[PDB]
Amino acid sequence: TTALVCDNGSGLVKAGFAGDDAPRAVFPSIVGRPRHQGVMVGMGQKDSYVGDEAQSKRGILTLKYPIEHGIITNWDDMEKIWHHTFYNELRVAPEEHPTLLTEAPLNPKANREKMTQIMFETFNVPAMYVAIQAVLSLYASGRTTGIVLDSGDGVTHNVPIYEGYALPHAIMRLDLAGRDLTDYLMKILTERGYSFVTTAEREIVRDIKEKLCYVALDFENEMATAASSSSLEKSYELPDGQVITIGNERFRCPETLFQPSFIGMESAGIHETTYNSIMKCDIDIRKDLYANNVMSGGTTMYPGIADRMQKEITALAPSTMKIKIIAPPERKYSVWIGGSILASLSTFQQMWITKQEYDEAGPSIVHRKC
Amino acid sequence: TTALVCDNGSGLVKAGFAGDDAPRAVFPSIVGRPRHQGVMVGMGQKDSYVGDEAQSKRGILTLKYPIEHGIITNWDDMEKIWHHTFYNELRVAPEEHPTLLTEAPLNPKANREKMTQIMFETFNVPAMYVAIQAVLSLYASGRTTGIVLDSGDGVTHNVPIYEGYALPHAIMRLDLAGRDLTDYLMKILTERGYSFVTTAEREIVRDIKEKLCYVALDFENEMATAASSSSLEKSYELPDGQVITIGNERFRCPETLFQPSFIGMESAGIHETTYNSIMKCDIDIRKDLYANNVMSGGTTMYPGIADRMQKEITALAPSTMKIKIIAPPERKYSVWIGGSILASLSTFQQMWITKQEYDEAGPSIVHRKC
Amino acid sequence: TTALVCDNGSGLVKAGFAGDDAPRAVFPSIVGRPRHQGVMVGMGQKDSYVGDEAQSKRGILTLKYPIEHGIITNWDDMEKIWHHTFYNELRVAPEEHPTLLTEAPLNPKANREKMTQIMFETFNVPAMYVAIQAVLSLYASGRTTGIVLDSGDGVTHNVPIYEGYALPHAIMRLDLAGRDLTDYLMKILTERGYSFVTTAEREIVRDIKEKLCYVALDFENEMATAASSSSLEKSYELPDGQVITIGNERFRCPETLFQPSFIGMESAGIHETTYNSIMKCDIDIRKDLYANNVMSGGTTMYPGIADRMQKEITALAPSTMKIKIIAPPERKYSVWIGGSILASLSTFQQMWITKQEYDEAGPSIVHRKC
Numbered sequence A, B, C: 001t002t003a004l005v006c007d008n009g010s011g012l013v014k015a016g017f018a019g020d021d022a023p024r025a026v027f028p029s030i031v032g033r034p035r036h037q038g039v040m041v042g043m044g045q046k047d048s049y050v051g052d053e054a055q056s057k058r059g060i061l062t063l064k065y066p067i068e069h070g071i072i073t074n075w076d077d078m079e080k081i082w083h084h085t086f087y088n089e090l091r092v093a094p095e096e097h098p099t100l101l102t103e104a105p106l107n108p109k110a111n112r113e114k115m116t117q118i119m120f121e122t123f124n125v126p127a128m129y130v131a132i133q134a135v136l137s138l139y140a141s142g143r144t145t146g147i148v149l150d151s152g153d154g155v156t157h158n159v160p161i162y163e164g165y166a167l168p169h170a171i172m173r174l175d176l177a178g179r180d181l182t183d184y185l186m187k188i189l190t191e192r193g194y195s196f197v198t199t200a201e202r203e204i205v206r207d208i209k210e211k212l213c214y215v216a217l218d219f220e221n222e223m224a225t226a227a228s229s230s231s232l233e234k235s236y237e238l239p240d241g242q243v244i245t246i247g248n249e250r251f252r253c254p255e256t257l258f259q260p261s262f263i264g265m266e267s268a269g270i271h272e273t274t275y276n277s278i279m280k281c282d283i284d285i286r287k288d289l290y291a292n293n294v295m296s297g298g299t300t301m302y303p304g305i306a307d308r309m310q311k312e313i314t315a316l317a318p319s320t321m322k323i324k325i326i327a328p329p330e331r332k333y334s335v336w337i338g339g340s341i342l343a344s345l346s347t348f349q350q351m352w353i354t355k356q357e358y359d360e361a362g363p364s365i366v367h368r369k370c
């Protein structure tokens, strides 16, 4: 009778059971299909690969992400992803496990309705629920009041909560996250002569970004430092043994979070978005929001991002405001951890969307229960 | 109901039954016709000789190869060859044996279509199939990943397969193989005063090449070694008792595979062709191609060719790539062995081109079934 | 005091003086070196040939292209090319002529820096400038708004400009162009029995492609038409008098621009790349980009390419968008014509990189002036 927690991000699936501290399985949410011709008979050559097996065979596949900026764009591939999650990774039967799902705020309603319908009809779950990922990150923190910035592969969002009450008019959503940083790193890696163009070579660039990239405390000083000397240059070995070297692409890629105009966007950086979200809240709750800046997600995992956020929000806010950025070492899984905490609570047990409620009230049950 | 496997190379016919480990018969694919005048009545003096009987009587015949660089140029002589194979060597009736045939990649389509037509009309086979020889060579080695370098009398070709998927854009074909090496050995044997000019004397030079020639690990060092001393000189006894001696023609002949400019070709050597074929494949599959270099065919049978290929590809590839050359002792028949393995599989039984498909869909069935 | 305009493409050099309507000289950017042995004394047998003289003597040379996908890979041969351009074709002294050079977008920075250094040190130009070829193509058409699809021997690129402002985040670059089409035509010409393998025979195949190839309005219909009848077959006479015939290779070769998977690439066709470039631009500027599709370069010179681009972009775009493809009859020289127009303007005269700026600011002047 244990509940399931599935955190469907744009880039990774974090799935497990409620009551744990880490997910069962964490695998990329990709579906790969062969793009060359098979010449050997049989071999169990399947027509599509999901998750880690698609990354294993990615040299002969075309990798597709069913989720795009927090929105599911391919629903057959997403059913493939969910079937993989339930049967090959969790190795469970979804007929007896309530499933907690997550979603970004300010998302299309059809996304939520269709997840509800697929859970209740394709996978026959007894109950389900869709929770906002930033509220779950606050549950993982253990703090009732915080402003949460969640940055994932697809979306960056700010949700300010005070005493357990959210201020939905102050919620920010920015469609700039890890995948845009990967694409920008590809583009600026072309400057040194490195050409990554295929979907399989997007994973190599994502690995380069996760290993070698960091957030500069002061961008212009680091640009001058990289110009003067090669102290910031690091090498990376490609899957075929070729070695690439990057000097200032290491901090130019994550700078797009603070200067979105690098990729041609008109928006403000994550620091200015956070400050604007705080300033749309009530004046009496702003001090507690300044002191509680919870960062979650994999795009907040850069070395130096918390210090840079500290510096920028301190510059924006008054001098008597006491700015703290809470960046737990496990913030790459804060949404899943908070979802496990929430699904394990006794008070939450009356808040599931039951199967009978779905049957006798339609998929639109999800907008008024969640 | 057993299937036939006929490997028609430019130089030799390898024919047998599926399920065996070696072909029934291996004979030269030559048709000899007398060039002098008959003076004795009768004797069963036939107008043409095929296979081993043409080599037996080659002193009074003009030997012709119906296949030239993997392409059948004389179709009447090729029907003679196939009739010999079926009736005098296999001693079977082709009306009840499906026949698996082999062909080099990047070959004229008319070649394949006309083999299909002759099999289905002249020999009345119940079914047939044309397979690429490098895929068959990969079947024999028992693996589904690797780049195959197949060298025969007529063509040398590279086909990279990964997980059973071929990359047809990375397939190389080089029209330099054993027959070009035989001709070059004739030409450079003229340097010591030995004149072989006739088609029958081409077989003597081919025998010299198969017995005395080897691949030098370092060409310039071996050239210096042969210049300094006579330690590399070996003798060969001609059919009439004359003894010839060759010192550096032993490794100068096979060096044409690595330096095609010896015979006036502009192409790259087999090592550089293999490296170029690997580098036209996806970056994620290159490590497994480096570690799996399958060599098949009779022109890869030189002493020291695998070590030289190891050395050259190691020089071309990065230092962290782990280069292996797989050169089985039976690689002179890898194509036939793999064809037997393929024709014996149960999954392949639905992939034959049946007689009815040919009748009601034309000879062009072979491009979309094979 | 007239300025020079040198359009260095991967395949051809277009050089001339600013203010003209056509370049002085258009010759292949190849350097040929003899591959056989000289037996006649003297003759002025030079060790290397550049341009038209290499194509004249290509039967005894190995032709090398110093530019490869818009990137200069051999710099000594490129200095040979530039010296030829300046002294044997333009017959000028570069010490008193500012030189305008062109480059593809998303190119290595070392390419631009080394062209700047060689111009300012080897050829002693008073000033120089490197311009993006698509902006120059937009100069030639006399408009300041439109998305340019420039296809050359080495690179195909999309650059959307609106009101004179470029959107660098929407710039596409595809490393598929005329040379890849020539190689594909060689590969599929092997199907009818025609074997072109040498670098000199690459020019014959390029001539065949330029004379006999066209873009099919509907590929499958043309494939059916070529299968049914021989109405699409045309003959071509080789330099030695042999006549070759091609039926569907005529439109199968240029189809690789719309189906890059023909040569094993994962990218999208030029139509889908153009649509994707338009859709990464602001919603308010998309109507003017749809109506202004400037095509330039020699690979856009196929019969029927503009109509096919019209059809495909119309299929992709909404029905109320008004799609025009602007394909001037002189679009093979749009980059050079636009460069001449730009170098002749009075406003541009303050935008040269002067010699003193180079001397006292390094070769890195080119990234912040251009």
Ligand SMILES: Nc1ncnc2c1ncn2[C@@H]1O[C@H](COP(=O)(O)OP(=O)(O)O)[C@@H](O)[C@H]1O
Pocket (backbone or CB within 6 Å): A008, A009, A010, A011, A012, A013, A151, A152, A153, A154, A155, A177, A178, A179, A182, A206, A209, A210, A211, A296, A297, A298, A299, A301, A302, A303, A332
């Ligand atoms: N150590 C790291 N440094 C920088 N970026 C990272 C790191 N680890 C993961 N990422 C990025 O975070 C993204 C995945 O974060 P995640 O929270 O799983 O997103 P989602 O919730 O959308 O799945 C990926 O795009 C990856 O590039």
Ligand SMILES: Nc1ncnc2c1ncn2[C@@H]1O[C@H](COP(=O)(O)OP(=O)(O)O)[C@@H](O)[C@H]1O
Pocket (backbone or CB within 6 Å): B008, B009, B010, B011, B012, B013, B151, B152, B153, B154, B155, B177, B178, B179, B182, B206, B209, B210, B211, B296, B297, B298, B299, B301, B302, B303, B332
């Ligand atoms: N031991 C050997 N050493 C060198 N060359 C050999 C040897 N044995 C055979 N060959 C060459 O290999 C060629 C035959 O190889 P094979 O694989 O039968 O070619 P094909 O498939 O074209 O018939 C002949 O030209 C012969 O000269």
Ligand SMILES: Nc1ncnc2c1ncn2[C@@H]1O[C@H](COP(=O)(O)OP(=O)(O)O)[C@@H](O)[C@H]1O
Pocket (backbone or CB within 6 Å): C008, C009, C010, C011, C012, C013, C151, C152, C153, C154, C155, C177, C178, C179, C182, C206, C209, C210, C211, C296, C297, C298, C299, C301, C302, C303, C332
């Ligand atoms: N009439 C034509 N039809 C098709 N292709 C052509 C034609 N004329 C030239 N080309 C191709 O265009 C390329 C040269 O175009 P160009 O604009 O000069 O390129 P670059 O700017 O790279 O020199 C050559 O590869 C040639 O094959």
Ligand SMILES: [Mg+2]
Pocket (backbone or CB within 6 Å): A008, A009, A010, A133, A150, A151, A152, A297, A335
């Ligand atoms: Mg997330």
Ligand SMILES: [Mg+2]
Pocket (backbone or CB within 6 Å): B008, B009, B010, B133, B151, B152, B153, B297, B335
């Ligand atoms: Mg063979």
Ligand SMILES: [Mg+2]
Pocket (backbone or CB within 6 Å): C008, C009, C010, C133, C151, C152, C297, C335
């Ligand atoms: Mg050009």
